Design a protein around this ligand. Structure first.
Ligand SMILES: CCCCCCCCCCCC(=O)OC[C@H](COP(=O)(O)OCC[N+](C)(C)C)OC(=O)CCCCCCCCCCC
Ligand SMILES: CCCCCCCCCCCC(=O)OC[C@H](COP(=O)(O)OCC[N+](C)(C)C)OC(=O)CCCCCCCCCCC
Lengths: 287, 263, 287, 230, 263, 240
């Protein structure tokens, strides 16, 4: 299991550095993709451009949110590429062919000039001449030094960036951090209830449809309580669903703040042609 | 199980056995650790005599001393009362003297202390090799061989014989001591069954009554002290210690602290 | 066991890449077949081509669903070809006979030219001469490089494709991304309840037939409640069953959504000749 | 660990190995606290050095110990001094026996001579600085203890205040959509227990946020900006 | 089982045994760790004399100072009262001195301290090889051989003998000390049974009274202090500590905080 | 068992005993960790003097900083009230300075700290070999041999007697310092039992009232704030 997910340097000129890129960059890339998909903020951002089809929103509102989603999902690539740089295997393998024999020191110049790239390439795979073992050890501790030096700097850079956004967020945001904590509680907890009611509403709707088919519904002990407590009649139209989907930026009405699109739609501040109908106009139905 | 143990501790046989076992173990450890059998030609009997006798006396004096009733008996000594005091002293004598005899018997049966004690007192007239007309080197070699100076120069056989002889004598002493003590013990107990005025059953009840009244008197004295002290608090601070004293608070003055300074 | 399905490289010329194809392609073929069979969204598509018998539906609705069938089916072949490549045993076995002796390096020109195909093909099975050991290890690292490079590339393409389809699926979807979540919740509740009542309806119907035979039914405690609580009168007609099986693409009636053919049928928007009759018409029975 | 003995380059490795990880840990501590962001609210909205140095030292405990534990090993300092053609050989000691061992004794002596200087600075900082600030402040420790506990208890109640009120408002929004709420048994009495009448406007939230230093009036002590809000 | 342990703690014998065992362990650890037996030609008797005597004094002072009864007796000092104070001070004397005596006995039994302390005082008139007419090399070799200077030059056997003698002598000294100590203890108890005004029953009652009274006084003092402060805080914040304050709240002013600053 | 532990904690004898044990344990690890007896020819006494005094006095600052009673003493000090402060300082002092004397005794009885400190102050008059009229190499080798330089040049006899003379003087100093500290503890304990207006039992009552007074007020202060927030929230959103 762990043996398959491991680094194995191919000691070859102009070939070892490509492997270091793919065996490290691709695992970083896939971990980046997983974070983007799971985050819900990208889909309402997509839904924003989906519904308008007119570019109503300016560049500024999209500028912050576009970067907001990418940064929050970039946690996986940094916490992976840091570990690879700490190991140093990728950097020593990729930059082995670029080591200059002249810069090597702490030994007499025993390195042949016939094929310098070929000999340096095979150092990581223990295919190193004994008379050049120190040169191997010199390069082994030279490139591994650079692997960690970029590694430690990269940990510093993310920490500086994480400071810069969070510090700049409070100053530039029109709301206080305590109120935003209350607001962050609302969004992170309203969706808990909204998804919980959707399952119950669907289950009641599903039960009301199976009954029409057979004549009875086989419901569990909990499921009879749901039917009795929450009996439904119909469904919510598509435009009613479109009014609660998208990005929301603290719109206020008459001094009373609104925290989400569902709250905005609840107050009635969000809401002839027939589209995607099952059957044509009733005038055509008569014929 | 604990009650059974408390029953067994009441029995003197288990206690005498525990004491004997501890003495045997201590003797073994002491002999194996801090004996070393010195080869001092001038004074070698002193070391063995001390190591053989002095610990017995120390254990004997301890066995008498740590018993609390000894001080009471001495104070009474300092008719029927005399008989009772003598009988109590005889009863405690068994536990006082069980340990030093065990020490002496084990040391004599082991034999090393006696071998390293009376080596220079041996006789050389049996062996013509120890002529020594000078009368000086004989005691030197005689006190030298037993401890660590084997000196394999065709003399060891003689040394070996000497050791055996001493060991044999040592063994006898031990057994003799045992025998003697045993006879003494017998007649001693016989005296306790003849001079004593109480019957066989009256003595056990009387000892039980003594232990019970002593323990109950000690507990009653402690409890009376507690009642007196608590009375002093309720008089001074106006409340009973360890009770709900939310009723009144005295707040005594500076002079009141000197009042409880009398005892 | 693993040993039964283990990989044993045939170190023979023009023979190993056939085996590597069969030892990897066939297990990928089976996992592709299993994905098709277990997926329900292919049988209703087959049922769609069955009942219409006229090709009423166009190619555009079919293509978007065939992708959904193949998109979910192709996870197992991909995650199997990924691990097989990452192991590298299959690839080094297959391409060992195509290694160029001219491209061989890390050693002097001691590689025999007598039987280049025969000597190279036996490298995976360690049946190599001692004079060719460095040549053997050179191939063992060169071919494993191409194996793992394709292994990470295929993950990279797949991870990008999964991101690419989902991004376009939401963008081109007329519905919002939150109604589809509700729609997905309903279809899971409809299928969970429908299979539950189908078991109960069959059991009550079966118990009524067994009662007709013996005069009583030996029912446990739970089966007794089913007969009392859920009594049946007859079987549903065949056209009623045919009206809920098939492919459904979000038809809407009077501004109210309909989420499945069972839901559409329950609204009455779905529903002379006799088929597969046990006995002929009553007029023919008389004679 | 990895100790690159390369000449003219180990000193860069040494500095990055003790300095960068230390400041990063100083970072994680100061994200974790919420008091630093309180001053951000006040400065954006509008005698403040006493608080700024106080919060900074609260989260500075763990970056220091990593720096101290770095010099306990002592390998970081010996590399920098040894590096500073036999100079490369001096750098290549950790990776001419008398001369190489002659400097090495000086390296460890110099390395240990700096480790306790920091511990003296922390010892001076924790002791001397703490008394001078508290002595100068007219508020007593009993006043300070009531101060810290006033703020500490109020956020815990406020978060409990925010959580219950939010569930009342959110459930009202969900009921507007479907017509009912799949509230649990505990949440069943939550809506009936607290029927909300209205929401809190932006100025009400903004009035209570900020740093407060005993702006007392009418003799009634005030400890936080929320206290002066009422 | 815990109650049994507490009862054993009440009895002094287990406590003195534990103290003796701790002293033995400390002596063995110190001897193993830091002796080093230096040869300092000039000053070597002082090293062993310090290592023998000073730890005994530190143990004596630690044992005597750690008991608050000695403090109370000194404070009272700073008839019947004199006699009770003397008896009270003497009561804990045995536990105070049991540690240094155990230290001294173990050190003398080991003999290494006596060897590294009394080597320079050995006799050389008996040995003709140790003439050393220069009167200077004799003392340096005498001080230097016991430490680490083996020097197998037909001298070691001689030095071995002297070591043995000292070891033998060392043992005797230790033994003698123990004997004297025991005798002293006995005579001390005799004084405790001769100069004591209390009878066979009054001593235990008095000791129990003192211990019980100190315990109940400290507990009652703690209770009264807590009660006085519940009242002080009730006046202060308007509600009783440990109660429910849904009735009244004082909301104190700034000037009030200084009122409770008197103590 | 936990109650027994708490009762033992109430007793300062266990606190002092444990503090000494950890200082000894930490010292033995630290002496073999990064001490090395550094071999500075020029100024090596500074290293020995630093390790002999500074680690001890640092724990003094730690002891003072970790106790809040001194904070009340200095606030009032910057009569009976002053006299009580002295007793409160005296009680805190005993636990404050207990640790360094343990560290001072252990290091000095170890001997390695003072051999590597006062080696340069050793006298070569006893030794005819260390003439060195140039007065330059004599101090170089004097600071050289004790650190790690065995120097098999028939001069090793010099270093053991120097080491043994240093070791012996080191032991006498600590045992004198321990004895001096014990006498100082005795007399200060005597001053506290004489100048104190409280009796042998009244002082315990006063200390008991002090310790009981801090906890009762502190818990009531906590209740007083929590109770006020509960109304504040009631006035804020309308629930309790
Ligand atoms: C697996 C967890 C291990 C623990 C360590 C990680 C802790 C994660 C939680 C805190 C960090 C966090 O999430 O930071 C969040 C911010 C996002 O800021 P924004 O873009 O304005 O988003 C707005 C904030 N919203 C989403 C809450 C509204 O990130 C950043 O600014 C950038 C991410 C840092 C890494 C990538 C750096 C840039 C790419 C590389 C350039 C060389
Ligand atoms: C063991 C786990 C390892 C982790 C990797 C697997 C993750 C599984 C979950 C995501 C997959 C999924 O569900 O993919 C979903 C989509 C299907 O999109 P659609 O056709 O529009 O269907 C609409 C979505 N439905 C089905 C929910 C209705 O797939 C794809 O389009 C591509 C699937 C990737 C494999 C095939 C890529 C093309 C062939 C190879 C080219 C070189």
């Amino acid at each position: 299991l762990f043996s398959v997910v491991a680094f194995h340097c191919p000691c070859s000129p102009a070939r070892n550095y490509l492997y270091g890129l793919a065996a490290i960059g691709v695992p970083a890339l896939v971990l980046f993709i997983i974070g983007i998909i799971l985050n819900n903020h990208t889909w309402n951002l997509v839904a924003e451009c989906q519904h308008r089809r007119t570019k109503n929103c300016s560049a500024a509102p999209t500028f912050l949110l576009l970067s907001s989603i990418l940064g929050r999902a970039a946690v996986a690539p940094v916490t992976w590429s840091v570990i690879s740089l700490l190991r140093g295997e990728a950097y020593v393998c990729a930059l082995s062919e670029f080591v200059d024999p002249s810069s090597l020191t702490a030994r007499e110049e025993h390195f042949p000039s016939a094929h310098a790239t070929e000999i340096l390439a095979r150092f990581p795979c223990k295919e190193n001449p004994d008379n050049l073992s120190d040169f191997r050890e010199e390069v082994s501790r030279r490139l591994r030094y650079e692997s960690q030096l970029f590694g430690w700097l990269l940990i510093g850079v993310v920490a500086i960036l994480v400071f810069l956004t969070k510090c700049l967020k409070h100053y530039c945001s029109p709301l206080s951090y305590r109120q935003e904590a209350y607001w962050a509680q609302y969004r992170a907890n309203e969706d808990q209830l909204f998804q919980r009611t959707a399952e119950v509403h669907s289950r009641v709707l599903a039960a009301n449809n199976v009954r029409r088919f057979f004549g009875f519904v086989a419901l569990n002990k909990d499921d009879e309580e749901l039917i009795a407590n929450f009996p439904v009649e119909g469904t919510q139209p598509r435009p009613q669903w479109n009014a609660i989907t998208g990005v929301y930026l603290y719109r206020e009405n008459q001094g009373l703040p609104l925290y989400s699109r569902l709250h905005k739609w609840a107050q009635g501040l969000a809401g002839d042609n027939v589209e995607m109908a099952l059957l044509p106009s009733a005038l055509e139905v008569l014929f | 199980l604990n009650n059974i143990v408390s029953s067994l501790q009441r029995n003197g046989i288990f206690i005498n056995s525990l004491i004997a076992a501890l003495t045997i173990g201590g003797q073994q450890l002491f002999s194996s650790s801090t004996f070393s059998c010195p080869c001092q030609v001038g004074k070698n009997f002193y070391y063995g005599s001390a190591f053989l006798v002095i610990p017995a006396l120390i254990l004997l004096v301890a066995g008498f001393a740590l018993r609390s009733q000894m001080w009471t008996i001495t104070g009474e000594y300092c008719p029927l009362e005399c008989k009772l005091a003598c009988l109590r002293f005889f009863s405690i004598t068994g536990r006082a003297v069980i340990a030093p005899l065990t020490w002496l018997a084990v040391t004599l049966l082991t034999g090393t202390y006696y071998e390293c004690a009376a080596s220079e007192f041996a006789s050389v007239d049996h062996y013509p090799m120890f002529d020594n007309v000078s009368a000086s080197k004989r005691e030197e070699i005689l006190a030298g061989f037993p401890c660590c100076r084997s000196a394999p120069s065709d003399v060891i056989l003689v040394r070996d014989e000497i050791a055996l002889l001493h060991r044999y004598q040592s063994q006898m002493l031990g057994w003799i001591l045992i025998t003697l003590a045993t006879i003494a013990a017998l007649v001693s107990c016989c005296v306790a069954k003849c001079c004593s005025p109480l019957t066989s059953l009256q003595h056990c009840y009387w000892t039980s009554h003594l232990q019970n009244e002593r323990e109950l008197f000690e507990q009653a004295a402690e409890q009376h002290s507690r009642l007196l002290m608590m009375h002093r608090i309720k008089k001074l601070f106006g409340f009973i210690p360890g009770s709900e004293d939310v009723k009144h608070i005295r707040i005594p003055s500076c002079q009141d602290w000197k009042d409880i300074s009398v005892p």
